[PDB]
């Protein structure tokens, strides 16, 4: 399991949690020196439990699919909650079985659907450690509309940060003051699958991508990534979604 406590949190303890999160995800190969997530894991071992603690010390446990870093659901006191999707329904067969009741959320977990539920795109939702503390607090009592925005915050500050070093740094910059994510941050989130695939295809194409990935950079500039020499590959991405899952 991994943990994170918002109480006394600072850019350092958060960095440590994101490092623990990455290290809990198993792999047997690296591709261009980036851990490659497994094609599949059977039964219970497919799911990592993140124990998160708000500023006052109340807690939820979030179940994470170790093969794609997708949040399946969470446990808040004696009630479990899972996205309305087959992958989550399957996870409910393994985690949080001892909850007194199980609620299916009225939405699945993808960004589009959560943004519909929440009533706004995530461009307009501040993120940061204080927002994570709010997220946690909200998920403590069922409210599907408020939960959608809380889950948007929670996915970005846990899974998207484990995936990209830049996004981890964005959150650390927002340790004591939330801010909406940069468009670069949005771009990386949206390109994770594409990048993971192009890095894997470069293995037999001499480090050249078969198809270029278009990103937005820090300065807000649109740019093409075409081979493994890019800073995105060499420094930024920390985890590759296996092409068997794309």
Ligand X SMILES: OC[C@H]1O[C@@H](O)[C@H](O)[C@@H](O)[C@@H]1O
Ligand Y SMILES: *[C@@H]1O[C@H](CO)[C@@H](O[C@@H]2O[C@H](CO)[C@@H](O)[C@H](O)[C@H]2NC(C)=O)[C@H](O)[C@H]1NC(C)=O
Please say which residue, 170 or 230, places its beta carbon nearer to ligand Y: 230
Minimum Å gap between C-beta 192 and ligand X is 5
- Length of the chain (residues): 246
Per partner kind, with CB cut-offs from 5 to 8 A, the member of ligand X, ligand Y, none near residue 109 is ligand X
Minimum Å gap between C-beta 212 and ligand Y is 9
Site for ligand Y in 23-52 (CB under 6 A): none
Q: Which stretch binds ligand Y (CB under 6 A): 38-46, 123-131, 163-171, 227-235?
A: 227-235
User: Residue 226, interface with ligand Y (CB under 6 A)?
Assistant: yes
User: Residue 145, interface with ligand Y (CB under 6 A)?
Assistant: no
Burial 60-84 (b: 16+ CB within 10 A, else e): bbbbbbbbbbbbbbbbbeebbbbbe
Total of residues contacting ligand Y (CB under 6 A): 5
- Residue with tokens 């851990």, as numbered in its chain: 35
Per partner kind, with CB cut-offs from 5 to 8 A, the member of ligand X, ligand Y, none near residue 193 is ligand X
Per partner kind, with CB cut-offs from 5 to 8 A, the member of ligand X, ligand Y, none near residue 32 is none
Determine the Cα–Cα distance for residues 222 and 208; give it in Å rounded to an integer.
20
User: Residue 230, interface with ligand Y (CB under 6 A)?
Assistant: yes
Please say which residue, 69 or 140, places its beta carbon nearer to ligand X: 69
**Catalytic site positions:** 160
Minimum Å gap between C-beta 208 and ligand Y is 6
Minimum Å gap between C-beta 239 and ligand Y is 21
Per partner kind, with CB cut-offs from 5 to 8 A, the member of ligand Y, ligand X, none near residue 82 is none
Structure tokens at 134: 């709010």
Please say which residue, 193 or 226, places its beta carbon nearer to ligand X: 193
Query: Quick one: which of 3, 13, 137, 227 contacts ligand Y (CB under 6 A)?
Result: 227
Residue 155 backbone dihedrals phi, psi, to 5 degrees? -65, -50
Residues that bind ligand Y (CB under 6 A): 208, 226-227, 229-230
């Amino acid at each position: 399991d991994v943990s994170f406590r918002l109480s006394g949190a600072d850019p350092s303890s958060y960095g440590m949690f994101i490092k623990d999160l990455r290290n809990a995800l198993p792999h047997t190969e690296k591709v261009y020196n980036i851990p490659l997530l497994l094609p599949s894991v059977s039964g219970a071992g497919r799911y990592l439990l993140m124990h998160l603690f708000n500023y006052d010390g109340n807690t939820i446990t979030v179940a994470v699919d170790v093969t794609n870093v997708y949040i399946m659901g969470y446990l808040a006191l004696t009630t479990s909650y899972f996205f309305n999707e087959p992958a989550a329904d399957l996870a409910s067969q393994y985690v949080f079985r001892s909850a007194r009741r199980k609620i299916t959320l009225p939405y699945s977990g993808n960004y589009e659907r959560l943004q519909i539920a929440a009533g706004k795109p995530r461009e307009k939702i501040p993120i940061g450690l204080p927002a994570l503390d709010t997220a946690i607090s909200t998920l403590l009592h069922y409210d599907s509309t408020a939960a959608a925005g809380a889950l948007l915050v929670l996915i970005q500050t846990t899974a998207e940060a484990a995936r990209f070093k830049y996004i981890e740094q964005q959150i650390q910059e927002r340790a004591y003051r939330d801010e909406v994510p940069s468009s670069a941050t949005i771009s990386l989130e949206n390109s994770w699958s594409g990048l993971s695939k192009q890095i894997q295809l470069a293995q037999g194409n001499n480090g050249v991508f078969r198809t270029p990935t278009v990103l937005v950079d820090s300065k807000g500039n649109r740019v093409q990534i075409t081979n493994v020499t890019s800073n995105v590959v060499t420094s930024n991405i920390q985890l590759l979604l296996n092409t068997k899952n794309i």
